[PDB]
């Protein structure tokens, strides 16, 4: 049997790779020696082809010009600050410890220094619940209670572009255009429509999977399709 489509992806051929050369920049926080002195101005508001969300262009004191992840409510001319003693204003990036409890935050660091990792997409946000000298418990958009090093920086506010998901694509044409600007193969042929040779759900006199859809975690790649290690399925119950 030939390799299934999921295996082709792993090679990282052109068809599957993301259009990097077309992308703008990796949105990371600013590395400050210390002091918190670092502050800049919002020059413009652009659209990041990589996240479909907006982005803010900023110019600091020391000459630095770097595009940053634009939360909601930031405009041209405004002022942002990066550091330990930064003001608690929307957009200002600072460690979790300095941030008061119950405030919506985005672009949270998974480890201090990495430059952000959590809460980055359209209109999402984390939630700072607890404080300690050792821990800092954050509520990630998925609802999980992430325990974090209070030294990890995070931006105040919710990510802009909220409400994108709300309106349907309406037509194949529009989806096509979204996907072209991503490293995803599109469209998608259901494995049950393929031949016996091309995918486990293939073949048969009609369209149906011969094997039960759920499948073990331990299964080798090439067979790992369908409902993976499902803790259950359906909605009923």
């Amino acid at each position: 049997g030939r390799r299934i489509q999921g295996q082709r992806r792993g090679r990282g051929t052109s068809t599957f790779r993301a259009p990097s050369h077309r992308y703008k920049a990796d949105l990371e926080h600013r590395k400050v020696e210390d002091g918190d002195v670092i502050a800049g101005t919002v020059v413009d508001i652009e659209h990041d082809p990589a996240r479909s969300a907006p982005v803010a262009a900023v110019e600091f004191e020391d000459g630095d010009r770097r595009l940053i992840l634009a939360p909601e409510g930031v405009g041209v001319g405004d002022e942002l600050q990066v550091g330990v003693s930064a003001e608690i204003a929307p957009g200002n990036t600072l460690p979790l410890a300095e941030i008061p409890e119950g405030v919506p935050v985005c672009n949270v660091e998974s480890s201090p220094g990495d430059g952000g990792k959590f809460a980055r997409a359209s209109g999402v946000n984390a939630q700072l619940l607890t404080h300690d000298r050792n821990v800092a418990v954050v509520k990630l958009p998925s609802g999980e209670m992430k325990r974090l090093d209070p030294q990890c920086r995070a931006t105040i506010g919710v990510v802009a572009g909220g409400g994108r998901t709300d309106k349907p694509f309406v037509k194949a044409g529009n989806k096509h255009h979204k996907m072209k600007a991503r490293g995803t193969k599109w469209p998608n042929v259901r494995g049950v429509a393929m031949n016996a040779v091309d995918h486990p759900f293939g073949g048969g006199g009609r369209q149906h999977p011969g094997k039960p859809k759920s499948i073990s975690r331990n299964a080798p790649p090439g067979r790992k399709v369908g409902d993976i290690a499902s803790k259950r399925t359906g909605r009923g119950g």
């Binding site: 508001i45 803010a56 909601e72 409510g73 946000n125 909220g162 409400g163 309406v170």
Partner: protein, 73 residues
């Protein structure tokens, strides 16, 4: 609105596109001063044609329900 879709697509698709584009094409109050000239420049990009105040907000809305909550806290 969705009058350009013809009879194709259905009620739910051309109705969810008519209202979401009906509130996207409305007079929006700008956060800088108070003039209702904010129009949609792009995906999430908002700008007021009066003072040129270009800013960030929801995709189709200049302000989202969760973006008004950041102010409180």
């Amino acid at each position: 609105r969705s009058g350009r879709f013809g009879a194709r697509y259905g009620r739910v698709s051309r109705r969810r596109v008519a209202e979401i584009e009906s509130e996207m094409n409305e007079d929006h109050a700008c956060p800088n001063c108070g003039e209702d000239r904010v129009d949609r420049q792009g995906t999430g990009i908002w700008q007021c044609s009066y003072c040129d105040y270009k800013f960030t907000g929801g995709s189709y809305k200049p302000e989202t329900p969760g973006g008004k909550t950041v102010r409180r806290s």
